[PDB]
Ligand binder design. Structure first.
Ligand SMILES: OC[C@H]1O[C@@H](O)[C@H](O)[C@@H](O)[C@@H]1O
Ligand SMILES: OC[C@H]1O[C@@H](O)[C@H](O)[C@@H](O)[C@@H]1O
Ligand code: NA
Lengths: 339, 346
């Protein structure tokens, strides 16, 4: 079943219920996931209207870009030339800058394929928008299937050499309530390295660190409590996790990560090289979600993308997008229920 | 009464009915007017869904900007420095460039005041978008009242010094059918001067021409056919009208123009200094409007704004916008019946 309704400020809410009766919903404000529920229990964090996102936090569930993450001093090099992108966090360009793609109303079209339903959101980033060369014609297709598979398929094409590395900013919280820490969830992650941050500004420090024998080694499932409790300089620095993890084996077929709570689990697949994990290290902020005051550690992201900091650590990758080249990205979140 | 519904591609249609029973409609796709009807007769040109605007022509009824009209070589001078804007028509920047504001989904909120209903559309033009310094927080409020007044109120504030001069691209056609030429309509226009274009590229020529007593003199109402039939150089150049007219007297209180067909008339008021008129000089194109093949001269605009060409003709004005200054503009289109006695045949 498909249902579309007003979500506020002219935005729409497209709700998809699969054969199993699982519900997922997205809004064109930011080509964003709003909710994901099973048996009346929320799996992710989300708000109840457009205003909340714009007033409270515009990142949750959104498509963020054109470049996800922090870009040092807002600087990228394009065709040997420096370009300063819009600076929204101190001198850094965070998730594409101020009033980026996550705050725009994207156009969209729904395609019902039976066992699968797709919602194709579209938006054009004008040449020069927030400093980014273009125009960039972008699309983000969010699909939901009878097997409880939520897929994100990105496509983009630029009229000019530019940079492109968007991501999905959903926050999971299998407790189905923001006031409950994800400390009790188990996390498995197929990455043997992480990218340390330099300091409170959060720019990449410059090195790649081996995570073997650290509280950040999740190759073997472990309770997030372990990481939250760690004395690791990197953990103390952010008061949780806020880092890029480097995947050991690339390709969409491999289950890159798994998040579990009791009988419920979410598997992560992507064709991207890294997963940026942020554990909602908000302290006392207490942002309200469904009337629940959010707790420190009340959520966790799995931002599949090329790792931030490639401007300083080329080994991480190259987010360059040449004119006329067809950018593609695929990320899958698969829901399972232990029976 | 107000109604809302999906208009296609995620856009919405906001429909108003005033106490007199007059209906008007708008979509957030380009903070645009979609229809205006009197007794089941369309007063303007418009399509039936969002895809038609995007597939056929994205300008009709839209809010265009940041700068309406043609900017030669896309060059503007901002606070002493030159900036090249997006070039979408040869080397010119036409209507703010490619995939501009008329093509975005603006957010909106409706305020019901009873006798008047306001539909405020909002959009942020990021710093650097299409070459424009910014960021610019814009809003376009389209309102309709029991007095048959359709008002357009623009507001904007930029973070940086930039340029700003948007307009409303509504096309009237009192025949209620695009396949019927507006040659049969009477036009009165309070302008003694116009701005000639250089050639087919349509940039301004450089001079201001006096049009008194020519076929482009509408001070005293005359049929549009007088202009269309004219062999004046400027008319032949564009195959009709596609020009800025300079208002002789400024102020929102003055009826600057009036378009009449039989008992129906549209009056134009504005706080802007010129009205750019385009008479849908599409020749044999035939874009379909409600399944009607649009005819050459099947429509007419009254885009109130600062005349295009101030880059070469400083006398026309200055479209610059200082960082932190609040820009405002107001244009009103008012519907009336039996104001005068328009009984003609063509
Ligand atoms: O990824 C986005 C998040 O990045 C974190 O480093 C910040 O502390 C959050 O405020 C922000 O929402
Ligand atoms: O104002 C926009 C209009 O300008 C005219 O000069 C062009 O010929 C039209 O195709 C265009 O829609
Ligand atoms: Na809507």
């Amino acid at each position: 079943s498909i249902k579309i309704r007003d979500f506020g400020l002219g935005s729409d809410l497209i709700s998809l219920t699969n054969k199993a009766g699982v519900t997922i919903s997205f809004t064109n404000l930011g080509a964003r996931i709003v909710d994901w529920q099973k048996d009346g229990k929320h799996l992710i964090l989300g708000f109840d209207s457009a205003k909340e996102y714009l007033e409270k936090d515009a990142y949750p569930g959104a498509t963020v870009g054109p470049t996800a993450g922090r870009i040092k001093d807002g600087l990228v090099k394009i065709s040997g030339k420096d370009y300063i992108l819009n600076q929204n966090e101190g001198p850094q360009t965070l998730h594409g800058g101020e009033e980026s793609i996550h705050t725009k109303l994207w156009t969209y079209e729904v395609t019902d394929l039976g066992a699968e339903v797709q919602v194709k959101f579209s938006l054009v980033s004008n040449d020069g928008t927030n400093g980014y060369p273009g125009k960039i014609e972008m699309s983000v297709t969010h699909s939901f299937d009878d097997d409880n598979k939520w897929k994100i398929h990105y496509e983009a094409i630029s009229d000019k050499d530019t940079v492109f590395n968007p991501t999905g900013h959903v926050y999971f919280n299998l407790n189905g309530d923001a006031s409950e820490s994800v400390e009790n969830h188990g996390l498995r992650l197929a990455a043997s390295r992480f990218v340390p941050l330099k300091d409170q500004t959060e720019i990449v420090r410059g090195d790649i660190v081996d995570i073997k024998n650290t509280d950040l080694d999740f190759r073997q499932e472990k309770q997030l409590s372990n990481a939250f409790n760690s004395n690791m300089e990197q953990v103390q620095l952010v008061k949780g996790i806020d880092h890029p993890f480097l995947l050991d084996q690339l390709g969409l077929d491999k289950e890159q990560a798994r998040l579990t709570l009791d009988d419920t689990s979410i598997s992560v697949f992507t064709d991207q090289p890294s997963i940026v994990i942020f554990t909602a290290n908000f302290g006392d902020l207490g942002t309200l979600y469904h009337e629940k005051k959010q707790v420190h550690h009340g959520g966790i992201t799995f931002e599949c993308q090329v790792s931030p900091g490639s401007e300083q650590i080329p080994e991480l990758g190259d987010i360059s997008l040449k004119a006329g080249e067809k950018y593609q990205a695929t990320t899958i979140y698969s829901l399972h229920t232990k029976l």
